[PDB]
């Protein structure tokens, strides 16, 4: 159990060619283990902006309108205290079962537009299937998509899903996301998408990973090896990138510049990961 | 702008029948939904043989499950039966030039712009835009689509499956309630308009089944579009709405089980039952409210 | 070296029973095929009632077709029976390339490294090299293709239909052998390793039905392999090769009409039938010459 | 009604070879009945051993080299060809030639293939073309429908795109177009073929794909890009679609710098012909 404090920056610089509309999320969110201290959202020139949520709220959204043949840049920065648990997940050996799940985490085990689990359940239960320990399972996930898939930047768009990276065997943090997530689904492990800020991550920017819910707990993964699990400020949780874009776009724009930035504010900080060998899970709560 | 409205008294049942082969549990979907213009009389769910059962809903609350857990080699029966009242109004669309602005949508209606599982919009926005987007009325436009979508693909049970979506049935040109609602949901949000699947008991329904269609969101408005032409559109009582069939399953299995009998049913209780239909030159909307 | 067999010799019969909806032509694959190393003794095929029917090759050769029309609203049999003698050689494979030298290959061997409908090895390159790259003898590569496929993909009657394809089998992980076929075929050429869709009659095939597996062009001679591991490969009668299943359909249907009985036997004539089967741990190919 | 023409025909590319790399090249013009070569060189540089084969069908000349780890090389075909073609009168093609009637070698040509999933099409291209009368009409119908539905777009598409993707996503360049004509034609049981050639007027110059359909006993051309006179082009090869027709394959690691390719027109009065939907006249390569 440990709490951490970051500094997060994000600014991007779009020119819009027609009358557009823009729904962004950039905002860190605020939860009971996630507190912001301090933030600001500055756009220039100065257009006003609307945040909303869904009715979920588990992601600050801001909207603005711009008209054409104009630019503008819209620049975030605050100030987040974040706190995790190691769990040990020795006594994991079997799931949660479905009559006894919380109402808000039976949306998860369900299959989504990026995430086909219902296409995937043979191959999944072929995998994985005979992985006893459910954190074990989820691992082996993950550690399978970090060893046959390739980090491959511009192998992708956003009309990839779990379900063509699974042959394509290319893809960048969102598509490794969508296939974790997939996979858990696919063995009836809720599980969901998750953004965030992330420390130490090189180059800089946005990131995507998972979580999938172990015996009562949110867990993180992330497949990629990208970054350090305890360096992640949430900027949202979702069925997956539908809910979860950076920016979505009616009309017609292109970001012509984007800077993503997180900083540890701890003296001394000391990085976690996962481990075949060690049965312990990671939460933000 | 003008509308009428209308109140309407049915009677709706169903009845599902499981061989259980392994330890499986069960999320069922069959309750007519209780809002503000559809009120439940009274209603009784019966498991037979008795099974312990739990009704929950998402945080939406646009369905309500129902779940229960069986033992390997059962056999058992649920059955479902209820008087309801339902409210519409028929909306004018003369002036539906275009979509509620994306900037002023409701927070909750926003979602509904999305690609979802069965609902793959952000691969049909080319082909759309060709067939449809030269129409100019909002509301003529959503009614293109679903009479697109009547005289080109073809009504077939047993064509499609769970598994198959919109960016199928276009290519396919077969299928099944579930698979013109998840198309015409597909290709509204193709073109930014707001749409959301939807799911009931159906009046004059003909072989009686659990119905699918989808809503579109057009000048503030929540309209009814059914592409099977198969269902007078007064005659629905509402289960559930949701993104599509994923949000709105009658049964999600987690285990081995199959179905071995269905019956549905829905009749009007009202001294006179007058269909609506949509006509290409009414510009008139269905809504549930 | 090799190992030459003696003559091995078999009894094959198919029958099949059609009901024809509307005015429909077949073209059939059912006729042993004639080469070098496979001699038909005796032949006989009967049609119920007589339905006029020609025999036809493709330029390639390497498959029998026979076709005829029927009328609308009825129904027609055909039987085929033959007696035939195989033989095969046992080719040690110890010495096995690394690569297949593709500069130098017979011009008919090259269209087997090309995607075809069924095996679209083009889209699996990456997962092929993933999983197979590091193995370092064509042979054993082909064989770890066969043993992958037997050990991840179950063996299901009715999981797949005609236009089921590799692509589909690597996720679905379900089907039938042509299936397997397809998916060995795919991940050979995908490899660079010429691969092509064989059919047959199989001795103790249990059911009994016809039978589809693949070859791969190893070291100048094309080795079987049947990654559904249900007959002793010495126990195949060769109807067809071709790039995949368009290229040897049972039956190809222009019009509508669907079976309604087919039985296929293969028996062998010898006094002592030794099954052949390959282990991880022999590098010997078998290969029909 | 017959016609004849003469033709100079260019390519060539330069590869940059990473590691030993075998090619196979599809560059050569065909020698048929039809289209006759007059003269025709083939130079590597530096000289590279090259040796050229047909499939057993013979629809096309391929050669092929193998380049060591480290090397460039380049390839230059320069060519004189004569085409002939036919107009062929389609009032009376009113039934698709039985299938009992066709030839063996026709066959083929009926059935799905790597790019055109016909077998995945048949309830859409029913009812979007069933109800037409005339083959050739029925024909024109599909690639019309295909140039006013599917926009010309360089690079929206790559070597793994097939028909079945392009009917959705509605751009693609010629090769899709070529299967996608092709697969919609298979799917109302009118054989067809994948067509590749040089191209007189293309502009900017480059190597074309197209499409032929079996009609009363004659190969027809159709080129739903609308990009070139039909009568401007002189035949490459021809295949159930471009698995039997790459430019390039290449078994190794190796990449094209540069690619050039050029069409001219040897006579002076060149008159470029295109289908009318009303007249319903055929052109044949035969």
């Not at 951490?4 to 991007?12: E, P, Q, R």
């Not at 992330?222 to 350090?228: G, I, K, M, Q, S």
């Not at 400020?233 to 979702?238: D, E, F, N, Q, S």
């Not at 012509?256 to 049965?279: G, I």
Request: aromatic share 12%; net charge negative.
């Amino acid at each position: 159990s440990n709490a951490m404090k970051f500094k997060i920056h994000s600014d991007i610089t779009y020119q819009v060619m027609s009358p557009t509309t823009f729904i962004f999320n950039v905002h860190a969110l605020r939860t009971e283990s996630q507190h912001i201290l301090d933030e600001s959202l500055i756009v220039t020139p100065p257009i006003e902006i609307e945040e909303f949520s869904y009715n979920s709220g588990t992601s600050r959204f801001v909207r603005l309108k711009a008209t054409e043949n104009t630019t503008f840049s819209m620049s975030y920065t605050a100030t987040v205290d974040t706190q995790y648990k190691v769990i040990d997940q020795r006594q994991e050996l079997e799931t949660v079962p479905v009559v006894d799940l919380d109402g808000d985490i039976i949306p998860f085990l369900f299959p989504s537009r990026y995430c086909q689990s219902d296409k995937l359940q043979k191959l999944a239960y072929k995998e994985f299937g005979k992985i006893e320990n459910v954190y074990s399972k989820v691992l082996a996930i993950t550690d399978w998509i970090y060893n046959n898939v390739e980090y491959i930047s511009g192998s992708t768009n956003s009309q990839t899903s779990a379900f063509d990276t699974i042959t394509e065997r290319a893809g960048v943090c969102r598509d490794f996301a969508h296939l974790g997530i997939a996979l858990c689904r696919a063995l009836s492990i809720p599980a969901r998408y998750f953004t965030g800020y992330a420390f130490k991550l090189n180059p800089p920017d946005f990131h995507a990973c998972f979580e999938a819910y172990i015996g009562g707990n949110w867990i993180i993964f992330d497949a990629t090896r990208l970054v350090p699990l305890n360096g992640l400020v949430k900027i949202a949780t979702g069925r997956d990138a539908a809910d979860a874009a950076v920016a979505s776009i009616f009309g017609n724009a292109s970001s012509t510049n984007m800077h993503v930035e997180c900083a540890s504010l701890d003296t001394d900080f000391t990085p976690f990961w996962y481990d075949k060998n060690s049965l312990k899970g990671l939460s933000f709560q």
